[PDB]
Amino acid sequence: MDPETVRIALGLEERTAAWLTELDELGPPAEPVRLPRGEEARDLLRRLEVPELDAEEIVAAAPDPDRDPALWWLLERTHHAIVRHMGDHRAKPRGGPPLPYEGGAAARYFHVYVFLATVPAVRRFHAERGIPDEVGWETLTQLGELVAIHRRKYGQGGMNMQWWTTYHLRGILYRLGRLQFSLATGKDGTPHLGLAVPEWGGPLLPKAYDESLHRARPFFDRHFPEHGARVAWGSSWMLDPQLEEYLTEDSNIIQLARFWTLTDSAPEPGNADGDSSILEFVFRYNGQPLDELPQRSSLERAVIAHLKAGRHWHMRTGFVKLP
Ligand X SMILES: *[C@@H]1O[C@H](CO)[C@@H](O)[C@H](O)[C@H]1NC(C)=O
Ligand Y SMILES: CCCCCCCCCC(=O)SCCNC(=O)CCNC(=O)[C@H](O)C(C)(C)COP(=O)(O)OP(=O)(O)OC[C@H]1O[C@@H](n2cnc3c(N)ncnc32)[C@H](O)[C@@H]1OP(=O)(O)O
Ligand Z SMILES: *[C@@H]1O[C@H](CO)[C@@H](O)[C@H](O)[C@H]1N
Residue 18 CA, distance from chain mean position: 24
194 binds ligand X (CB under 6 A): yes
Closest approach of Cβ 181 to ligand X, in Å? Answer: 8
Show the binding pattern over residues 296-315: x = contacts other proteins (CB under 8 A), - = does not: -------------------x
- Residue of 115, 104, 121, 17 lying closest to 63 (CA atoms): 104
Rama region for 20: left / alpha / beta (φ>0; ψ in -120 to 50; rest): alpha
Binding partner of 116, given other proteins, ligand X, ligand Z, none, CB within 5-8 angstroms per partner class: none
Does residue 298 belong to the site contacting ligand Y (CB under 6 A)? yes
Break positions in the chain: residue before each gap, C to N over 2.5 angstroms:
none
Applying CB under 6 A, among 86, 91, 135, 204 the residue interacting with ligand Y is: 204
Q: Give the list of residues 6+ apart from residue 250 with CB closer than 8 angstroms, or none.
A: none
For ligand Y, the binding residue among 234, 242, 304, 312 (CB under 6 A) is 234
Q: Give the contact letters, 176-205, x = binds to other proteins (CB under 8 A), - = no.
A: --------x---------x-----------
Query: Which x/- pattern over 125-164 shows residues binding other proteins (rule: CB under 8 A)?
Result: --------------------------------------xx
199-258: contacts with ligand X (CB under 6 A)? 233
**Alpha-carbon Rg for the chain in angstroms:** 21
Contact with ligand Z (CB under 6 A) among 20, 147, 196, 279: 196
Interface positions, 159-178, toward ligand Z (CB under 6 A): 161, 164
State which of positions 36-95 bind other proteins (CB under 8 A): 92-93
Stretch of 79-87, 191-199, 213-221, 304-312 lying at the interface with ligand Z (CB under 6 A): 191-199
At closest approach, how far in Å is the CB of 7 from other proteins?
A: 22
Of ligand Z, ligand Y, ligand X, none, which one does residue 117 interact with (CB within 5 to 8 Å by kind)? none
Which of these segments, 28-36, 99-107, 181-189, 308-316, binds ligand X (CB under 6 A)? Answer: 181-189
59 annotated binding-site participant? no
Which candidate, 74, 69, 72, places its Cα nearest to that of 97?
74
Q: Annotated binding site for CoA, which residues?
A: 197, 204, 237, 251-253, 281, 298, 300
| Site residues, ligand Y (CB under 6 A) | 195-197, 199, 203-204, 234, 236, 238-239, 247, 251-253, 256-257, 260, 281-282, 297-300
| Site residues, ligand X (CB under 6 A) | 182, 184-186, 194, 196, 233
